[PDB]
Amino acid sequence: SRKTYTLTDYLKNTYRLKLYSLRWISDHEYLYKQENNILVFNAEYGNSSVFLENSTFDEFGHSINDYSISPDGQFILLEYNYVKQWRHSYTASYDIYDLNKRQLITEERIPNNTQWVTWSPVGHKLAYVWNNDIYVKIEPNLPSYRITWTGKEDIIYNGITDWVYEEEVFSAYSALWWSPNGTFLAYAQFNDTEVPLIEYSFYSDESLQYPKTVRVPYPKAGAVNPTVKFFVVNTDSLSSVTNATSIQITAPASMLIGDHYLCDVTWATQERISLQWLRRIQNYSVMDICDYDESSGRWNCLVARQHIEMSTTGWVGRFRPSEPHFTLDGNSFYKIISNEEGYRHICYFQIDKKDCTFITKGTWEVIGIEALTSDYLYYISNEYKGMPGGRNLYKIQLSDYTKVTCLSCELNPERCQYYSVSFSKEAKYYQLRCSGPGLPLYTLHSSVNDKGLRVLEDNSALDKMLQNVQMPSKKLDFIILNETKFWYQMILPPHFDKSKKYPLLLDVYAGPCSQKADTVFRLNWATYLASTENIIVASFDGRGSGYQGDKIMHAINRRLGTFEVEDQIEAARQFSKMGFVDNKRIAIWGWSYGGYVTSMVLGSGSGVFKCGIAVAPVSRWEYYDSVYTERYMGLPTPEDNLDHYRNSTVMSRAENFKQVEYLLIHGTADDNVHFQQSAQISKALVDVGVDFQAMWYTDEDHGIASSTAHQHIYTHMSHFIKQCFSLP
Amino acid sequence: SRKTYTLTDYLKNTYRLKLYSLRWISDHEYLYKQENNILVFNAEYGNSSVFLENSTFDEFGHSINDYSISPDGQFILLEYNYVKQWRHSYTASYDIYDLNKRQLITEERIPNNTQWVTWSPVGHKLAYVWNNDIYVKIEPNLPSYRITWTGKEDIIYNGITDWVYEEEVFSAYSALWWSPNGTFLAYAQFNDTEVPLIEYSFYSDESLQYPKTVRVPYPKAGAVNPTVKFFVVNTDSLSSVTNATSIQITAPASMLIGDHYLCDVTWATQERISLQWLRRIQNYSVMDICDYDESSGRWNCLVARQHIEMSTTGWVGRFRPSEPHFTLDGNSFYKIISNEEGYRHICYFQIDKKDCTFITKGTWEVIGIEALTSDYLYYISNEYKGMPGGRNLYKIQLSDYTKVTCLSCELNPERCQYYSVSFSKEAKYYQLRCSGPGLPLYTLHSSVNDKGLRVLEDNSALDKMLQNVQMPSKKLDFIILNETKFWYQMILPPHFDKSKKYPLLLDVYAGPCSQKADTVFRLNWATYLASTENIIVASFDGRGSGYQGDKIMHAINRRLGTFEVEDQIEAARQFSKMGFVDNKRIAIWGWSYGGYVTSMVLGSGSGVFKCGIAVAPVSRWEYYDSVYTERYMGLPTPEDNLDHYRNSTVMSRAENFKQVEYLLIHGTADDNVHFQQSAQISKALVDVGVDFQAMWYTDEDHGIASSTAHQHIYTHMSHFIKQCFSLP
C-alpha cells in the first residue's frame, strides 16, 4: 500500500539527506552553521556560541555566497558575486569584516573579479590572485604588495592553475601555499603559450544574436602541455614601492630531461618544503626536499635526499602520486605506496635514508592517512571483513606497528560500514561520518580513550519519512571470474521475489581505479528504477577497478577499452543465469568513462544487451586530456602506444550497433569531454547506416547539472529505458 | 501493380527520372553530354556528332569535374580539383585544352585554388578570380593582366560575392559581367570589414585532434551589411607595364543616402549598362541606365532615365527586383511589375519616357519572361485554366498585344501542365521541358511556325517500371476560406478509398512567395509514405503564398509567423471534415521555413496535431540573414518592427509543446540557418520541462545531403512518423 519512490521524488529532492559539515578551528573547537548563524562548538562539552549572528549582513546589499574566517580570529572574508568557471575555479568580489568592530573595511579592498584568495595559516595576512597575478596584504586595510607582473589571460598563470592542472593534477584552482609561520608564500607559475585551444560555441540566452566561441588552453593526448615553475617569496620583507623578490626552486635534473609535472607541495617545517614531481611518462616520480638557507636566503634541494618512486607494473599512485605526511620535526614522513604484493600500504621514510618501512600489510589497501601525532597514525582502509567496498578508521601505535585498533568497525555494524573522518588540530577529537549501508550517521569522538561524545546528526527525520515508502534494498556480493573474486552490487525492487524474472540495468563506470560496488547508501535514479519500475540496477567492478591491489587495477595498463569492457559483459552474462533476471531485457548505461564502456560494450556484438545509454562519453583517447589519458595509455605515437589508441575507439565498432538500441547524449559546452567526442560517434554511425537516438544539451557541461537539464535528461532516459523494457 | 514504392527505392534511386540537359551554343546548335562524350546537335535537322570523345583526356591524370567551351569553339576549359564552398561557390584547378591542335596549354596556366573563371561572351578571352582579385587573359597561352590589388580573404571581394550576396542577392558566386563585345569587364567589389562573423565548429575526419572553428562574415537581421562598389574596365586597352584602369560607377544619390544593395547588372548594348539597386528597406529600388562616353572614356548615368519602383503593400518583387529584358537597340525593355490590382504582369518601358505600358493583364501572373525577338516576346505564366500551380509558355505579337498564343497548353494536356523552356540564341529554337503531372517530357521546337521537331526524352523506360509499382495518385484542388480560393495537393495511397480513414502528414514550407500545391511530378519521401505506409501527404498554399497576386502574397508583410501558420492549422481542420482522414493521426513536418512553421504550429496549442518534425528550422528572425529577413520583417528596432520579431519566436511557445511529440533535427555545420537556432529551441523546451526527441547531424549543412546523412535522416524520420501513427 505505501507509495513507491518516484522519478519526481528523485528530481525534486523530496527525501533529503541531512549533513553535518564542520570546520575545525583549533584542537578543541569547530565552526558549524545553524539556521544560518555561524556557531562555534566546544568539542569536549558540546556547548556552542554565536560567532557571527544570522542577522549581520541583512543590509549588506548582496547575497553572500561563502565566508572564510581568519585563523587568529580578527577578520572574516565575505565572498559575493560568485561566478563559476570550471570544477574548482571561479571569480568573486570580496569584502572584509573587522570583527572587533561592527565594520566592513572600506579602503584597499580586494578587487572585484578576484580569482583566488587565502588567509595565511596563522594571523591575518591575505594573498590573492587578480588578473593572473599574485598580491599580498599584510593588514586587511592596507595596500597590497604586488608579487608577480607576468600574469596574462590564458597564457601565464601565477598562483592559480590552468585547465589541466585544475582538473587533473591539483583538483584545485589554487597554486599558493603559505608557510606554517605565514612567513613564506610559495607559488607555481604555469605557462600555456603553445598549448592548443579547444574551441566550442556557447549560445546563452535567446537575446544573444551571434553565438560566442569559448577558447580554452587544453592539451589533448600527446599535445604540447603547459610548463611550470616554482617560487618562494619572503612575505615579512616587503616594500611599499620596491619589487618583491621571488626565489626559484628548479625541478631536479632527472625531470628537466623532458616534459614533467609538479604534482604536490607540502611544507614539512617553517624551513623545509617538499615538492613532488612527475614525468610526463608517469612512470617515475621524485620527491625533492628543500631547506631554507639562513645565509644565502635561497633554497637548497640536496640530491642525495631525493625520494624516488617508479613503477614497472603500471603508473605511479592511483590518480596521482600519494601524499607525504610529515612528522612534526619534518625529519621523516609516512606515505601510501604499493607493496611487493601490489597492495597499497603505509610506508615510513626517514629523510636521509633510502628505503622505507612498511607499517601495514596484507590483502587489502590503505585508502588514506588521516592524522598523525607522535603516539599514533590514524588511517582509513578496507580491511574490515575483507570487503573492498567498505571503509573504516584505524589507529596504529607507533611504538609497535602490530598494535592496531579499528576505531569504527563495531560502533554500529549493520548500519555503518563506510566511514570518513575529520580530526581537530593535534588530533584531540574527531568527527566520524558513516555513509552506509544505513542512513548516514555523524558522530563526535574524543581521542584520548576514543570515547563517543555525542551524536551530531542521525537522520531520524529522513528515517520517519522513509518508513512510508517501498524502498529498494541493496545486495553487495561477489562472483568468480577466472579464479578471482570480483564484486558487484544490485539495487533490488521492494518485495523482491527470486521466482520472478526482472529486467536488468547495468549501471557502469569502470574507469581505472574506480569502485562502483560499495556499502554507501544513496537515493538516486536507480532507486527510482527499482522502487517504481521494478528494475534491477547492477554495478560490477572488474579488471582495472581499484582498492583490491595492482594485479586487478593495473590489468588494463596501456590497454583502456579492453578487459574492463569485457568484464562488464561477462558479469552481465552471469547475472543472466540467475533465476531472477530475464535475459530478454538487459540494458547498460553510464556517464563519461561509463559512457565509453557502455558504447564499447554495445559495439562489441555480444548479443547480451538489448539497449543502452551513453552520456558524455569519451569516444577516442586522442580526444581526451593529456594528464589523465597518458597516465594509463602512454603517448599516442608509433614509437609508443598509437596502435591501441586507434584500436580502442567507439567509432571502429559502429557496424555492431545495428544489433542494439542506442541513446547518445552530450552537453554542447563540455569543456572536459568535448562534444566533439560524441559528434564523431554519430558521424560514424551515420557513415554506416545505423539508426540510434540522440540528445544534445545546449550550453550544458560534463555534469549536465543545471536544475532543468538534470530533470530533463533523467526524464528522457527513464522514457527510453521503460520503452526498451516494455514497461507502460 | 504488385510491389510498392519503398523507402529504399527512394533512397537508392531505383526509379530514375531521365533528363535532357542541353547547352545552346548558337542559334541552331547545342551540346549534350551522353555518357561522358560531348555531342554536338544541329537543331533544324537533328543530326549529331561527337564534339569531344570521352577518351580524349585518359592520360590527364585528374578526374575532370566540368568543362567550358570557349564561344568561338577554339578552346576548352577543364575544371578539376573541385572543392565545394557554399551553394554556388567552390574552388578548383583549371587547364585549357587547345582544340584545333590537340594540345593542353603549358604556358601561363590558370592558378590553383581559382575561385571563378569565365570566357568572354564571344571569342576566347578569360577572366578569373584568385585570392579575391580579378585577372584577365587575352589569349589562353599569354600572361594574365592583374585588374585589382585590394583582394583580401573574408574582407575585400573583387568579382565574387560574400556569403549574403552569394546566397540571397545574386544567387551566384560570380560578380563579373563581360560586355557582349568582350570589350569591357564590369565587376563588383564587396567590403565585409565590419560584418560580424558567425562561428561554429567543424569536426572533420576522426583523425583531427582539435575541431576547426569555421568563421564567416554573415549579417544577421539588423547587423552591419557588406558595402558594394561597381567598376568597369576596358579590356582592349591593357598593358603589361601600366596597371589596369577601372572606372567606378557610383550608385544613385537616392541609394547613397543609406544602406543599399546592388541587386542586378545587365548589359543593354555594347555601350550601355543597366544597374538595379535596392534600399536596405527593400521598399524602393532604382534602375540606373549608364552609357560609355567614347571621348571621356567614362560612364554616365542620367538621373533622368532612372526608373523607380516602390511597393505600397509590401516589398519589391518576389525574392528580389525583377530582371529587365532589353530590346536589341537598348532603348527599351520589358520587366515584370505588380499591376494596380496586385498581379505581376509584363510592362514595357521606353528608356527616357515616363510610366510603362502593360502588355499582359488578368487575374494570374507572369512567372518569367523567356525570350525577346523583334516580333515576339515569349513568357511563362499560370493563366491556363486558372491553375496557379500550372505553368505554360506563351507568345505575344509585339505589333498587337492582343495577339497571344499559348505554345504549350495543348501539346499533351493531361500529361503536361507545368513547363519550363530553354531558347537558343536569337531564339530560333526552343526546348520545352514538361514537369508533370505525367512523366517528364522533353521536346525540341522551331520558333518560325511553332512546329514540334522531335521528342528528346519521353521517359518511356520509367513509365514501364512504374507500371509494376503501386504508385500513389496526386489530387490538386482548392478550398474556399473567406471569399478566397486556397489551393492544396494531396498525395494519395494507391487503391485509395474515400470510405476508409487515413492518417495525414501535412508537409509544409510556406515561406513568402512559395508554392507547395502544383502539378509537378515527383518521386520523393512522400511517394514512399503514400505507397508503402498508406499515409496521405498533403500540402497547402495559404496566405503569404505566391503566384496568386499581392493580396495573398503581402498578407504576411512584416508579420512572419502569423497567417501562414494559422492557415496551415486551418487547412488541416478542413482536411479533417473531408471524411477520409483519421483525425487522431495528423502530423506535420518541414524543413527550413517549413521547420519554423512546423514548430510554430506544434506550439500554437491547437490540439489538431499529434506530432511533427522540424528540420533545420529558423526559430527567431534576429538569427537569420539580413537580406531575406529584413525584406519581410523590416528592422528589429523599437522604431521599426522589434515587437513582431520578438513575438514570433518558437521559443516563446515552449510550454505548448507538452501537448505533442516533436522531433527536431539540425546539421551542426549549417552556414545558412545556424545550428544556433535549434540549440535555442532545445534549451527553451528544457527550461519548461518539455520532453521531445532530437538528432544533430555532424558536419552536415542546411541540405543535410551527403548520401549517408540523407539516407539516415529519412530513415529516422520514417521510424518517427510510423510510431506516431501506430504503424508497423
Ligand SMILES: *[C@@H]1O[C@H](CO)[C@@H](O)[C@H](O)[C@H]1NC(C)=O
Ligand atoms: C562553553 O562553555 C564554557 C563555560 O562557560 C565557556 O568558557 C566556553 O567559551 C563555551 N564555548 C562556546 C564555544 O560557546
Ligand SMILES: *[C@@H]1O[C@H](CO)[C@@H](O)[C@H](O)[C@H]1NC(C)=O
Ligand atoms: C566592485 O563591485 C561594485 C559593484 O559591482 C563596485 O561599485 C565597486 O566599486 C567594485 N570594486 C570593489 C568593491 O572593489
Ligand SMILES: *[C@@H]1O[C@H](CO)[C@@H](O)[C@H](O)[C@H]1NC(C)=O
Ligand atoms: C612562456 O613560455 C614561452 C615559450 O613559448 C615564452 O615565450 C614566454 O617567455 C614564457 N613566459 C614566461 C613568463 O615564462
Ligand SMILES: *[C@@H]1O[C@H](CO)[C@@H](O)[C@H](O)[C@H]1NC(C)=O
Ligand atoms: C549535320 O549534317 C550536316 C550535313 O552533312 C553537316 O554538315 C553538319 O556538320 C552535321 N552536324 C552535326 C552537328 O553533326
Ligand SMILES: *[C@@H]1O[C@H](CO)[C@@H](O)[C@H](O)[C@H]1NC(C)=O
Ligand atoms: C597546382 O598544384 C599542383 C600540385 O601541387 C602542381 O603540380 C601545379 O604545378 C600547381 N600549379 C598550377 C597547376 O597552376
Ligand SMILES: *[C@@H]1O[C@H](CO)[C@@H](O)[C@H](O)[C@H]1NC(C)=O
Ligand atoms: C573596407 O571598409 C573599411 C571600413 O570602412 C575601410 O576602412 C576600408 O578602406 C575599405 N577598403 C576598401 C578596399 O574598400
Ligand SMILES: *[C@@H]1O[C@H](CO)[C@@H](O)[C@H](O)[C@H]1NC(C)=O
Ligand atoms: C599597380 O597599381 C596598384 C594600385 O592600382 C599598385 O598597388 C601596384 O603597386 C601597382 N604596380 C605597378 C606595376 O605600378
Ligand SMILES: *[C@H]1O[C@H](CO)[C@@H](O)[C@H](O)[C@H]1NC(C)=O
Ligand atoms: C537566525 O537565528 C535565529 C536564532 O536561532 C533563528 O531563530 C532565526 O530564525 C534565524 N533567522 C534566519 C535569518 O534564518
Ligand SMILES: [Hg+2]
Ligand atoms: Hg600529473
Ligand SMILES: [Hg+2]
Ligand atoms: Hg600528478
Ligand SMILES: [Hg+2]
Ligand atoms: Hg587511476
Ligand SMILES: [Hg+2]
Ligand atoms: Hg536583392
Ligand SMILES: [Hg+2]
Ligand atoms: Hg537585396
Ligand SMILES: [Hg+2]
Ligand atoms: Hg518572397
